[PDB]
Write a protein that binds this ligand. Structure first.
Ligand code: 1PZ
Ligand code: 1PZ
Ligand code: 1PZ
Length: 202
């Protein structure tokens, strides 16, 4: 109890889904960055092959955590970056947010594909399909090929759930929860970008 990462995730993101759906939504950077850090333990359930993905995501979340001590909300964070004209500058808060947002969407589609792929001990199909939908349009060739290689170093479905410390029943519940919770959040984040004419495809 409390060594169950899927449950720390579902709880944290259900709070954010309430904030985002309520009127006049103000998403705190502390609260947002914390929930994003709760995804990081999902790496280290994967092989050593995905340590390049783990470092990149964690580094970006660390930045958002570091930003959370000076910046009030996510909106304020983006506004400050527009005003400093560094939105697309490498390592900026807003740019990291966009990549992190894709990371959340990646987890979402993966959970969706995993739940569907029940009766198959291979994570090859869910992982491949989900990466193709979320990250393939944004990653260069070398990154995409390195990823397809790392797909062979993936654990089995049973072993993933074992390391996540859940049986099939509980896992499918807390995964479906995140999928439900993250959807309005991803939409909210997408809209922050679109409503400010920043785009989301860069
Ligand atoms: C269980 C199935 C796992 C499928 C494989 C997971 C897919 C993650 C592959 C991402 C490779 C990260 C290397 C790419 C780095 C950069 O090119 C970009 C842009 O960075 P910038 O130049 O702006 O500094 N980084 C990203 O797009 C961040 C993506 C990391 C988020 C990964 C989420 C993994 C989802 C959960 C996996 C436990
Ligand atoms: C070390 C790996 C050895 C395998 C080499 C054989 C693989 C066949 C490569 C087929 C050609 C790849 C198609 C080219 C895609 C281009 O769009 C990209 C540039 O766009 P972006 O990456 O941003 O999507 N091509 C590249 O970035 C380089 C293509 C790699 C070609 C083989 C690399 C081997 C280099 C050997 C150097 C001594
Ligand atoms: C030389 C040693 C590397 C041979 C690897 C064989 C990979 C089978 C063919 C894969 C191709 O699909 C890709 C480029 O096609 P695209 O991804 O655009 O559909 N080539 C490689 O992965 C190399």
């Amino acid at each position: 109890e409390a060594d169950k990462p899927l449950r720390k995730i579902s709880a944290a993101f259900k709070k954010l889904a309430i904030i985002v759906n309520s009127p006049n939504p103000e998403v705190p950077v502390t609260q947002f960055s914390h929930a994003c850090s709760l995804v990081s333990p999902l790496f280290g359930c994967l092989g050593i092959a995905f340590k390049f993905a783990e470092m990149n995501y964690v580094a970006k979340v660390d930045d958002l955590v570091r930003a959370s001590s000076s910046i009030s909300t996510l909106v304020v964070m983006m506004d400050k970056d527009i005003e400093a004209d560094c939105v697309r500058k490498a390592g900026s808060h807003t740019r990291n947010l966009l990549r992190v947002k894709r990371g959340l969407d990646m987890v979402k589609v993966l959970f969706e594909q995993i739940i569907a792929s029940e009766g198959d001990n291979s994570l090859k199909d869910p992982a491949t399909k989900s990466y193709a939908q979320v990250f393939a349009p944004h990653h260069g060739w070398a990154i995409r090929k390195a990823v397809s290689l790392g797909m062979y170093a993936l654990p089995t479905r049973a072993h993933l759930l074992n390391m996540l410390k859940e049986d099939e029943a509980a896992a499918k519940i807390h995964m479906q929860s995140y999928v439900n919770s993250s959807a309005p959040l991803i939409t909210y984040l997408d809209n922050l970008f679109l409503s400010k004419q920043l785009g989301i495809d860069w």
